[PDB]
Enzyme design. Structure first.
Site, PDB file in Angstrom:
ATOM      1  N   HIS A  11       0.746  -0.889  -0.350  1.00 15.14           N
ATOM      2  CA  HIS A  11      -0.456   0.055  -0.003  1.00 15.14           C
ATOM      3  C   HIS A  11       0.633   1.077  -0.173  1.00 15.14           C
ATOM      4  CE1 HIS A  11      -3.421   2.508   0.181  1.00 15.14           C
ATOM      5  NE2 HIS A  11      -3.126   2.525   1.448  1.00 15.14           N
ATOM      6  N   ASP A  13       1.199   5.126   0.129  1.00 13.92           N
ATOM      7  CA  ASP A  13       1.246   6.070  -0.337  1.00 13.92           C
ATOM      8  C   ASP A  13       2.025   6.819  -0.439  1.00 13.92           C
ATOM      9  OD1 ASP A  13      -1.557   5.378   1.548  1.00 13.92           O
ATOM     10  OD2 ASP A  13      -0.111   5.406   3.030  1.00 13.92           O
ATOM     11  N   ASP A 123      -7.632   2.384   2.017  1.00 12.57           N
ATOM     12  CA  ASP A 123      -7.567   2.445   3.016  1.00 12.57           C
ATOM     13  C   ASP A 123      -8.815   3.923   3.151  1.00 12.57           C
ATOM     14  OD1 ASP A 123      -6.106   3.177   5.886  1.00 12.57           O
ATOM     15  OD2 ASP A 123      -4.903   4.325   4.449  1.00 12.57           O
ATOM     16  N   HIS A 349      -5.332  10.376  -1.497  1.00 10.71           N
ATOM     17  CA  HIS A 349      -5.855  10.873   0.092  1.00 10.71           C
ATOM     18  C   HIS A 349      -5.260  11.159   0.548  1.00 10.71           C
ATOM     19  CE1 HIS A 349      -4.513   6.053   0.164  1.00 10.71           C
ATOM     20  NE2 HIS A 349      -4.365   7.425   1.398  1.00 10.71           N
TER      21      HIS A 349
HETATM   22 ZN   LIG Z   1      -3.382   5.034   2.516  1.00 10.42          ZN
END
Ligand SMILES: [Zn+2]
Ligand SMILES: [Zn+2]
Lengths: 891, 905
Positions: A11, A13, A123, A349
């Site tokens: 994941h 980011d 998420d 996000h």
């Molecule tokens: Zn995330």
């Protein structure tokens, strides 16, 4: 006999607790490790690249020479990619942005030759109600998500008072339009299979836990083990781990899998008794403390910048360029893609949510500027292309033609604020000083007055000339060198009504007020607005007769939380601006427009107390924090400009101030006392209905902050209020009085989450200017109040041109058949063939409506959101919450 | 016809080379993207004209390969078409990546521009054999050596040389006059190149008419203009200008010109062909120009030298990233390769390309609009982050391979690196992790409490030891604390913890390019500042802080005394980003005449830190007239604006740091600027008897006069550019002032005062229009760093490398106890010389050879060259790292730049 699907993933980011480049360099390590393991371990099945194609671009920006190896890994299925460009926050990106993410994602996947058939929201801080329709109309039949719902035991009886409980980790997710998709809930989080042991004793302890955990919620024999986590390095020995697991558990078939195969297996085995979940999933049946909804008011300046670029691209640039194609037979697809990708680099996000470190948000501001600049260039070019092709011969040679555009989907009535160039004095080879003086002498000798005319020569009496000036300016011709000059500039106000997607040519030539000072009352045909002695407003609706007292209250509270979560100190009592020193200033006052400034000075705590610093350093959970506001106070001065326009039911506000205080929140309040238990919020392609009270069975947080796009509204069946905003995406309903609270500023000093990350720039020190609006509504004006709030973010566009022949008419409407209940969100062209594309949606989730949209001498064909043609016939009505995309071709 | 049976004399012709181009400032009076969208238009038009007009020969893409990347970022689908246009010769590219400002980019950056440009050219398959400096505001003295050793024998430039005709006697006193538009440009090392001067500017052939009447007027002027200065029959007509669109009908214009002028051969040409023709026809001897070209022989008003002090924050950021890449990241990774057999070539290229996007002249000069310079700050951050990540990784790779077994298990080893080219004596300011309390599955609060209780119960003191277990008594423990921190393992999840941190100072001397391992453990006089005396004193200097806050410094070796040093001077500035102008009758404000206070920050035998604070009232802004003068584009020399009547208090705080065994006194001046249209300088009056000074320039310590040329100069000021330092030296004694990104200095010749510009605040861009730039006022907090050293003949050159290498701190990393293949203490190079600077220590892309670059710190004298890397053999390469057949010298020639490839023996 269960089948245990191990999906290796990271994941990733893009930027978060470190600057992008720090994460970026570790991303190079991840992909390097992947390419090597694909070579050394033939049994390594695949790796899921977190649903976002931007990863591939980020890697190749550093190692462009690896493109063939990347392409090969995708071709063999060893790298499983997209189907999105980025992993967004749903609620804080525009409705259109949610679709462009998929359009670009698909374009990238098509280029690489593969995709993953799974909408990926692992998420996301709450999931938009329209996810089912958005997925189906993007060629996807499933979405995976980790937040917003808590799985009830697959064990418990029916009961069903809990709307957002799920027996299983698989759900039937139904949207407001009745679209249905598979919802795959990461019930044990997206890290449940992280770091699988390769030694027996540890593997036994791990698997006994993990298998039981997954079986607790699985509706089929197919168990999902997510082998990865946040920025997790690839598990290089995962093959050994899986082989061991098979040896230890004869009754479980462990397989290195991928999402495509997992869904295929699910499809075969899914039962008929999946829980249904209807609409948005925003942690309604939780304690309310960890929704992370307060990201909506973290670094509001980011959301304002996002709104500006989004409106620029969606509602100005694309519509103008779409129309300009008539003149040029070209449309700037490459430049628009570049602008959109640049903007969407701010849409992951952690980026848009304002929940990263200071360096990240400074980098984002630069990205906003870049995307804006590109959109702005293209919009000005498109407007000029149209204007230069208009037949402007009806205007005298001693006049200066200008074209005004309404690029929005409904009629636009406004008092446009203009600065027109009357005359140019070119530098040539003279000293600028000589040229400047010639301009000065022209104005000194000027005895006539400026006027605005139409093609018939008729003067518009409502135009107001505000002044004249001299200003340096320049032109950049297509085929020659820059051209500097001093312009004589004419500043004016022009009341105008322009139909949807229309233009009108006018020209500049030489040829009882709204506010009552004795009464402190602003009044037009719609509203009487009394400025109270304390600076709050009493507003009377002149049609309905309803009176609203004590509107526009400014409220300052402590905030000892972080970028994700607002926390008011124990015993916190707000400071109200209306209890300070009040001053009134008339900025302007005519029959067409009045601008009033209400200024308040009130003392607020300058900071939080010293305990806050210790609590952040010790990573004390926000709910346990004992910090209070400081004793020391300083004066904060707010100035709110109220703009009323003659023929406009919407009252416009702009509140400005210099924030020099830390750990606090400023809101503006609109108490309605309306009789209703629900409210309506502008969400992603839907006006979503929400309760005014959170669920008292589960909810513990004293507050219930919610997300909004362009507006929020209260309505009792016959009367109501609509509050519009520009990038102010957090509101709250205070249910005891049905007050609408709009967050104007939230200042905190740390990121939050898993550690202590100081973020002093999250305090938002310095100047701010927040814009929002009030409209009082009836059943008959409700939907118009909604498109006014959306389209009111977009000004009338103007451009100048000279007298010339042309193939275009001086006034023209590109479309007709508007409906109050039907929003227009896109007016663009299609990459493949340049067909005009429109996108519209139903502003109601409860009622169908007529769909009258028509482009003259075009036929419409229904497409999906990716602009691929469908077999469906063009409807004459919209279903509840229907999003309709249409391709238009000449008859 | 009749000429064949009645032949007349054969007549000569001129050849008119028309070179189509666009001078494409990447970003300037508009934001990058506004220019970028118009660049898309330019290349689109070019690709279209190549397909429609068979007579359109080529287009010169402004010497910068970045343009290709910029285009393809928007239109990646056009790559085949771009490649074909380059292969066919219709697009003429590079040979540079960007068009820099010479003086304001690092010495190495001037080389990296050529390295990346060459790399891009190799990838595309074509180049242009011409160094390209069309608009550069001053040309570095080493241009000839830099060109030759990057395989270029010519450079074109537009500023600083005055061509005189072939009709007048040349004036031998005019060092910067030329007879022709072609010159021999000779550098301080005696390298010579062909200098191609745009004597009629790079726009002389712009917008050529296609109609007879207008073409006659045009060519009658243009031909005469070009012939005026041409040394050969070959006339250079530059068909382009700033952001000029391609002239789509240039073929028609050339055809018409050929018809109208029988004695002139007009050809659509290119620089390669032009240079070939010149090779055939140039006279054997041309006018020589020696060294730097900085517009010395002009009125001094339009040199644009004050770009050096425009937005100083940009230059500081640039210096930080440049030092990070050149002197920390690269040296560490170069050494780490011995352990890992890999070097981060791709990541380094990315970092360098990112940084050099800030190096186009209008960017680094600070002479663009506000949006441009905001974007630049983001690019600096990005490049820095990449460099910082790689340096941390490299240091850890080295430390992890060191045999640290000599340290006891109850100690925490750490490695200290000197990544510079000479010995580094400093007092390292460290923060070490003593112990880690991991979160695990506990509430952080509980873990926090455990760490607190540990510190509370601590009875022993922290000490620093070496491999023999000997304690270092000079070390000073400043404090202990608890701080959240985290580790990011290569093969598993992030690891959060509360660390016990030990803050300390460690006096240490490290040889050039060396490391030493120490450890932190637990175990069981006269200060440098005298408050009664207000005197900082070590073995080198006695520094008396005067009652007014200026300094009296006594050189304890030579006995020389300097009174009234460190004066802060505030003046008005009613100019722009290019040019500083003090108003008519401007009188300076001096901080020493305000309110003075003194604060002791720290005071031990090893280090003393004193703050001198002055509060003085200065005008808040310029008067009301300045706005009108800017709006009307009144030339800066004609401006009548003065400073405002209204004043506000400006508080300056200067931290002076003296170290025990350091001859260099360090200064950091901080303040919050809330005033506009002004300039702040710090002054060092020397009264030294010398008519010249020495400035750190691009691979040279350049000698310059202390007075400008009074035959020509009218500007009352003479601002000059510097890299790391500037120096006055009388033959026996002198002063060296170092700086960190403070690139503008002036010598005030009557007292030989060295003036360093700390801040210059203006409100418009300047140049061709009114472009307001409120952020060029540089409002907000500033922190400027600089140094003083008193020198003798014996220490002169060491003061120069100290100013350069003193910009780079000792590097540290921690590691545990483990076996290793590396020694705990090791020097990677030996054979240092005070007169030889080291500027590069990196690896080569082709074969991972270790590349070094050194240069002679003197333009006047040769010196020994002793550089040796143990376990390696060297061969000579050019600047582009291509092996030459030249043998390794044992001496450096005057101003010689020497690049070597080292391979294991
Ligand atoms: Zn995330
Ligand atoms: Zn230039």
């Amino acid at each position: 006999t269960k089948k245990v699907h191990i999906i290796s993933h990271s994941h990733w980011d893009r930027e978060w607790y470190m600057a992008y480049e720090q994460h970026h360099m570790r991303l190079i390590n991840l992909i390097d490790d992947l390419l090597e393991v694909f070579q050394t371990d033939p049994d390594f099945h695949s790796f899921h690249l977190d649903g976002q194609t931007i990863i591939l671009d980020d890697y190749l920006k550093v190692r462009p020479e690896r493109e063939p190896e990347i392409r090969q890994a995708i071709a063999s299925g060893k790298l499983r990619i997209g189907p999105f460009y980025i992993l967004q926050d749903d609620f804080l990106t525009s409705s259109e942005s949610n679709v462009r993410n998929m359009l670009i994602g698909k374009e990238d996947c098509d280029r690489w030759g593969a995709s993953v058939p799974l909408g990926y929201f692992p998420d996301t801080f709450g999931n938009m109600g329209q996810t089912p329709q958005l997925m189906l109309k993007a060629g996807l039949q499933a979405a995976a998500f980790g937040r917003g719902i808590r799985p009830t035991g697959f064990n418990n009886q029916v009961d069903t008072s809990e709307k957002y409980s799920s027996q299983f980790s698989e759900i039937s997710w139904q949207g407001p339009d009745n679209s249905r998709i598979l919802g795959l809930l990461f019930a044990n989080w997206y890290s449940n299979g992280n770091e699988i042991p390769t030694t027996e004793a540890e593997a036994r302890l791990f698997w006994d836990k993990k298998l039981a955990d997954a079986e607790r919620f699985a509706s089929t024999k197919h168990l999902l083990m997510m082998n990865g986590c946040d920025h997790q390095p690839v598990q290089l020995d995962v093959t050994k781990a899986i082989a061991l697991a098979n040896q230890l558990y004869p009754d479980y078939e462990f397989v290195h899998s991928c999402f495509e195969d997992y869904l295929a297996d699910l499809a075969d085995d899914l039962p008929e008794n999946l829980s249904t979940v209807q609409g948005e999933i925003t942690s309604q049946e939780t304690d309310g403390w960890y929704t992370l909804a307060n990201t909506a008011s973290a670094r509001i300046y980011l959301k304002q910048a996002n709104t500006r670029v989004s409106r620029q691209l969606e509602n100005i640039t694309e519509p103008l360029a779409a129309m300009a194609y008539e003149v040029t037979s070209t449309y700037p697809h490459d430049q628009l893609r570049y602008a959109w990708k640049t903007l969407m680099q701010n849409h992951p996000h952690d980026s848009i949510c304002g929940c990263s470190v200071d360096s990240v948000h400074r980098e984002m501001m630069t990205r906003f500027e870049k995307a804006y600049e590109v959109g702005h260039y293209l919009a000005k070019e498109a407007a000029k292309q149209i204007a230069d092709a208009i037949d402007t011969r009806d205007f005298p040679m001693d006049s200066q033609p200008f074209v005004l555009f309404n690029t929005s989907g409904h009629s636009k009535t406004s008092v446009a604020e203009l600065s027109l160039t009357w005359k140019k004095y070119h530098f040539g080879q003279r000293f600028p000083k000589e040229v400047y003086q010639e301009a000065q002498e022209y104005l000194a000798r000027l005895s006539q007055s400026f006027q605005i005319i139409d093609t018939s020569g008729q003067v518009r009496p409502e135009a107001e000339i505000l002044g004249t000036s001299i200003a340096f300016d320049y032109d950049l011709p297509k085929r020659s060198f820059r051209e500097p000059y001093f312009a004589i500039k004419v500043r004016l106000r022009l009341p105008i009504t322009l139909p949807a997607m229309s233009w009108k040519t006018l020209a500049l030539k030489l040829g009882v007020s709204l506010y009552d000072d004795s009464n402190q009352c602003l009044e037009n045909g719609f509203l009487k607005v009394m400025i109270q002695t304390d600076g709050r407003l009493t507003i009377t609706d002149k049609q309905s007769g309803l009176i609203y007292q004590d509107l526009l209250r400014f409220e300052d509270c402590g905030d000892i939380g972080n970028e994700y979560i607002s926390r008011q100190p124990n015993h916190d009592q707000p400071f109200y601006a209306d209890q300070g020193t009040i001053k009134l200033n008339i900025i302007s006052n005519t029959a067409q427009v009045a601008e009033l400034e209400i200024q308040q000075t009130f003392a607020i705590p300058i900071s939080a107390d010293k305990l806050l610093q210790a609590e952040m350093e010790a990573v004390i959970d926000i709910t346990e924090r004992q910090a209070r506001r400081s004793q020391e106070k300083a004066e904060l001065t707010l100035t709110t400009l109220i703009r009323m326009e003659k023929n406009n039911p919407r009252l416009q506000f702009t509140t400005r101030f210099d924030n020099q205080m830390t750990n606090h929140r400023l809101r503006v309040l609109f108490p309605t006392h309306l009789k209703t238990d629900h409210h309506l919020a502008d969400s992603i392609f839907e006006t979503v209905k929400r309760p005014n009270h959170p669920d008292a069975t589960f909810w513990k947080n004293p507050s219930n902050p919610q997300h909004q796009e362009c507006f929020v509204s209260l309505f009792d069946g016959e009367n109501g209020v609509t509050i519009g905003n520009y990038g102010l995406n957090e509101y709250e309903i205070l249910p005891d009085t049905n007050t609408i609270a709009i967050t104007l500023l939230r200042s905190v000093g740390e990121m939050g989450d898993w550690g202590y990350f100081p973020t002093p720039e999250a305090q938002c020190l310095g100047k701010h200017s927040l814009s929002y609006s009030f409209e009082s509504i009836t059943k008959q004006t409700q939907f118009a109040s909604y498109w006014r709030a959306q389209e009111g973010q977009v000004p009338v566009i103007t451009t100048q041109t000279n007298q010339h022949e042309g193939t275009l008419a001086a006034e023209y409407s590109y479309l007709t058949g508007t409906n109050d209940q039907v929003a227009l969100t896109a007016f663009k062209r299609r990459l493949a063939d340049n067909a005009l594309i429109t996108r519209s949606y139903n502003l109601s989730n409860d009622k169908t409506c007529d769909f009258s949209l028509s482009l003259p001498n075009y036929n419409a064909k229904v497409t999906n959101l990716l602009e691929k043609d469908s077999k469906q016939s063009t409807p004459s009505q919209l279903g509840k919450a229907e999003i309709l995309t249409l391709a238009w071709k000449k008859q």
